Amino acid sequence: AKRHRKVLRDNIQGITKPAIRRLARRGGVKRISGLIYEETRGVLKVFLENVIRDAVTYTEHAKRKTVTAMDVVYALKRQGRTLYGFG
Amino acid sequence: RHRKVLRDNIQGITKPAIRRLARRGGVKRISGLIYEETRGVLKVFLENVIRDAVTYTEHAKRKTVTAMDVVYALKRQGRTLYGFGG
Amino acid sequence: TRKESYAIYVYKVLKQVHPDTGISSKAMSIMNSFVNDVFERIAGEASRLAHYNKRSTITSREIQTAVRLLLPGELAKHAVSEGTKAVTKYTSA
Amino acid sequence: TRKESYAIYVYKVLKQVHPDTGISSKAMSIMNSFVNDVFERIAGEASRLAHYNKRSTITSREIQTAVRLLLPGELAKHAVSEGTKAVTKYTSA
Amino acid sequence: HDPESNKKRYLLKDANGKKFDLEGTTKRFEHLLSLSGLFKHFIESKAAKDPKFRQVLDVLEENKESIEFQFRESPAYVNGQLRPYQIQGVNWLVSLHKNKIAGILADEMGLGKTLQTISFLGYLRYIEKIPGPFLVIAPKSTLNNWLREINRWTPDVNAFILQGDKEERAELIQKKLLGCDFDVVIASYEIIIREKSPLKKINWEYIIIDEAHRIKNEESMLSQVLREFTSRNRLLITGTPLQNNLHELWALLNFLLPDIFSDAQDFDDWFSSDQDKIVKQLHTVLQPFLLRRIKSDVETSLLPKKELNLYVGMSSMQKKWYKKILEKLLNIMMQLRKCCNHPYLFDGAEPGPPYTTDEHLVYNAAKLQVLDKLLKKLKEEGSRVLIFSQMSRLLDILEDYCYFRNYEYCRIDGSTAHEDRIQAIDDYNAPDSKKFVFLLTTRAGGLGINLTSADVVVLYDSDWNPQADLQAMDRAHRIGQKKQVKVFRLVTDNSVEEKILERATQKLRLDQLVIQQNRT
Amino acid sequence: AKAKTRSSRAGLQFPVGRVHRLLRKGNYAERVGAGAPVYLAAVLEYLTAEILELAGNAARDNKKTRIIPRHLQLAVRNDEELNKLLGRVTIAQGGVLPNIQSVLLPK
Amino acid sequence: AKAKTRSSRAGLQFPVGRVHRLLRKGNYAERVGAGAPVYLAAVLEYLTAEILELAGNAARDNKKTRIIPRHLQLAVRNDEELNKLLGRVTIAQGGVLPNIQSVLLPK
Amino acid sequence: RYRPGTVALREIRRYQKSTELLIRKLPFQRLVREIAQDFKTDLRFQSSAVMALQEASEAYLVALFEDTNLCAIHAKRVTIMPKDIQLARRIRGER
Amino acid sequence: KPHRYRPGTVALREIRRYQKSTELLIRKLPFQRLVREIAQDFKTDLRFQSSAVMALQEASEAYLVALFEDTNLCAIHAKRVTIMPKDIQLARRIRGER
DNA sequence: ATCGGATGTATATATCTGACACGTGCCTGGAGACTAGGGAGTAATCCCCTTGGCGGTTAAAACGCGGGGGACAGCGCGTACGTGCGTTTAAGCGGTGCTAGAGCTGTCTACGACCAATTGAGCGGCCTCGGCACCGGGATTCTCGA
DNA sequence: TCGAGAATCCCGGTGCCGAGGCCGCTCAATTGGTCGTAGACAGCTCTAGCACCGCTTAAACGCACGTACGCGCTGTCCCCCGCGTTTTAACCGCCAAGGGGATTACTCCCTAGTCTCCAGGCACGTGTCAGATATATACATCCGAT
């Protein structure tokens, strides 16, 4: 009965707890509560959904099927987070 | 408009007015040091807005500051205001 | 002299969404400002879109994409529906 | 294949303040993005300024007012000085 | 010898020894033009840049002792004796060396090429009195075999495998490599790429590569890394030159002799574009460089195989999914190949959520229907069967089907670790094993797998590269198969599988016409 | 050859000619398509009706006939899509939503 | 006569002609004056020189002679004027300013 | 006598239900003129301009006090403090 | 007794190490899988560019680092040194994102 | 738990003022020609992205344990806020006069657009050689347990 | 409160790759010359902003009294950190094929812009009433002390 997937733990879990700890260290925090990781994963998911929705709107207006760095940059600038370094 | 200089007008923003603003914000207890901080933040905000509005009125070669100048200043600071034109 | 207002069109829409209500002058001014704000937002986004895609003309496709970028969710869906309906009715005439 | 950029001019400016300093390609791309963003901000504010006063022309007066609106404090004074100096030199030549 | 003299000679005696050697290239062009006059085209093409090579060419042209040390009666220093064709191969290698040209040993797998190579190295060290250094690049799975062979036939040499963790590798480098206390080095592709710097700084007398077809994309990092090495001569060992392209053969040749075959455009214009009869005869350009033997005139006991193409037609859900894919998740032409294997490979095609392994498995796929009938028929005869597939998820499905019908299997895919790989091979190859089928991905296990006990191979899914399928067949056609191998390729009729089969047949025809024709 | 406005031809209430002229003289693009004013007018009329019905419902809730900025503010702030669309906007003579934190209420 | 670039006529390094072309083709107004490209090029040059001087100082502090995004970020975030002008901008591969809150320090 | 907090809660409900302006008008007008005289002398103002300034500034202060209240509650407290104001408008990005 | 650092003194060292560097702190393959799954709900059969994924990662990590700075400030304001989900929620509520 | 106050909260009546309906005219949107250029469709070349597999190295990640120090609760206390009451005061309102300056009209330059011809500035392609990354190894500093 | 000892910084050596520098060419800046229309300037006019002044009355202010809440201190768990040991997944290198998308020309057609007249639609100026304040007035409905 192994022809079924029964694999691939969630992709949000790929943001491991050490990675969140490293991000917290760059933010300058010393002690991290155990419940911080799930909250951080949810926050990141929401942010990514917003940005990716806008980028996909741009690329499908342009009549392509490839999301480009320019689409991502325009989406970010539209959200109000200008990004320098990708054109 | 002749030979007029004003001072200490920030004290005209009285403590009861700050208290009413806090009540509309939903605040129940107010520390005694809050009023000076409030006066400072109001003065800073007003300085920025008035600077931009005066810049607009200077560019238009006018001497009167108009509600539309104020609206443009607020909109460029990101605080769009409805009800005075625009 | 002779400033345009949008007031009569806003009143026309009001007299069919709520046939027996009225509207104050300050409220009407607020409604006018709202209409102008949304107009300039959508038009600016559409202009930027056309510039990004190196086009010279602004078309209903640009307007639709700007609507999808500016409005949240259900508002965007229903606004797209109304715009498409109006455009088809206008073209088939 | 021809993509215009400000890299050559940024390098010319760099060899004037730091004659012995280089710059990598990533810093060059960041500088190009910075120049484009500042250009867009100033030009957009000048366009809005000309529209507010019912003018058809963008002039150095509009550019100066836009600079004063956008740049903060000490940056604006020096920017206005540089622009005025350049305009006077150019119009005298 | 002593580590002091080896330190003196092994290391780069000069800062930059890579330059234009006039004597070597003059001898090379002289022998080449003596062999035939075809290479003037290559020389002219390469003369468009450097006039030194052109002046060498015209100097040689205007002017218009190969000791026959056949080394018959197999070398005394090599322990034991070896078969006559091995003597002939060693003689070919010696002739290659004395004529200052490289070559590709291309005997078929299992004939024995490591023995010939190490016997040639023993000739070098003993008849030419020249010890190492000698670099030997091999797939990681064969390093121990190389070491054992070297210690078996010519024991009195220094050979250490450069394998091990980073610290062990560093200490080995310092103790032996920089200490120059070795004769032959054994390394893997990944080791060569990783320990590039400590290995570049050696004056190599030879660079032997086993399974050289790995170096066939001349833009691969292994190719670039190997180019930076400095060596006197190079040698390539592989049983499958020209897998699926002529450009790959040119890349092998360009590595062998970068001055002769310096232009790929020349090699492509040679044959790629009677129209295709006289140009074929011009393959004497590759006659002196390639030596290949076939395991049919040398051995004998390996009856040949018979291959049958079993054509099947799509089932109802297969037709539905094929149409849904064709006219329109699904992001490639391979989705057509998934459907031709089993519709269950798409999620949702399997009926219903509470999945039950029942007859609908074989029912829903035609390949599986024919496979089930054939498997029952063979099980009547008791013959053991190997299943090959391009996809491992289909191997999961076949595993479920095989369990549902109570057959005994053993899987080897990329996921199964090496130890349990050996364990499963031993289980299947037990003299009284009760395992029936052996699920196996086509391109897995390298060449060490020896499933000689089985005698039936089914290629459930054909491949773009015909040589991969040929090796998969060879996993059962290997020497020692006293029975007769029987192979079955399942072809879905009137689908993309026919296109894949046609392309693979074109490539196989290309290989057979070019290299396998005059190999003698 | 009796005239017939494109606003009536499209079945709208907002003006299509005026929207066309504003687009044409607003320095948005060199050219303006024929259906862009119709699409934009339809969207603007939809949004106006959307906010206006909520404001009218609020005005009826407070037992009043006219709509005032307080009712406009209540509608916008109590509807989540409109509150996200008008997040950075101040409505003059509006106010705030009645809202007290539960920690402040007496035990 | 002999061509002289308007950049040289104004004593600048930035391209006055290219700035003029972008102004004319950017849908900013119907007409562009003669002094607007000169003024805008001068302003852009001034800002570029300012940020590059700060970044070069940072690079020399880190004992390197080549500006990298880290040095650009260090220059920008350490100056209040440029930090205000570039408040909403994120510099790719820039990092952060080293800053630890004093309550977090030992003893 | 009402116990402390009762009158404050009634005042919260009173001012969250009205729409008027909570600052006097003449003091605020004098303040804006005094501030403006540092940018250009002999300046005149429209009554509508001063009214718009008052509306914007009052909205700003009310929305700031909401965040300050949240900050004070976050620290297990019911009294708002200058540190609460500073934290609020440092997180907002106005620092 | 083997040597052991007291709690916190390695956290401070990590803070310095990671505020001195600039490289990305999340793994590229997990992040790419995450964005590819998220984009599946807006338009199936989407292709991506490597620079597009890189831009998404840079923006995301800058956002998360800024959020953690604000969260640390809230935690210190509450007289603590440990950051908590309530601190994250307060920081996002004041910024206007919730 | 009950009673005594204090505070909204409906309920009815009178005013007024601002919203709505009506009439003019003028300017702008619509109908109708005529035209040219923007954008759509076609075709060729080359590079990147997808899918489903393989092999290998090697740090990170996951897991378990111990123990320390930080969170959280509880207690006490002592100010500093809230509530309420007289007491000024200055904001709001109404009315008046004065004049600056905002807005409109008419003329007419001067300056931007546009076009044709010419040519230098800048972009792409190609090559190399220093700046910086990496690697021991050695001294220095800082933490910790005494 | 002085040694262990572990982490960090500072040196040299490699080595490699990307930043600068050079060359050719092409295409956008520059120069010279019409031309027409925006805006600059002068003059007028009338409106709204400013400066007063007087009067009333809420709102601000100063002070008292006294709770309750903010803050400091003390225990107590318990949860998070530091560290060692596995193990596993990221990360390179590969194979195959094919399409997506960017250029770079070309062709061409139909949809915009540009005019010219010319009616209606809309802005402005009026003239009413009804909906929304204002006052009283009685009711009910929390709050706080016995």
Ligand SMILES: Nc1ncnc2c1ncn2[C@@H]1O[C@H](COP(=O)(O)OP(=O)(O)O)[C@@H](O)[C@H]1O
């Ligand atoms: N005495 C011998 N003479 C010849 N060949 C031998 C002798 N003993 C062993 N061999 C064979 O030599 C082979 C080595 O060559 P092979 O395995 O084919 O290497 P590769 O697969 O790299 O060609 C072994 O498989 C072994 O069977």
Ligand SMILES: [Mg+2]
């Ligand atoms: Mg082998």
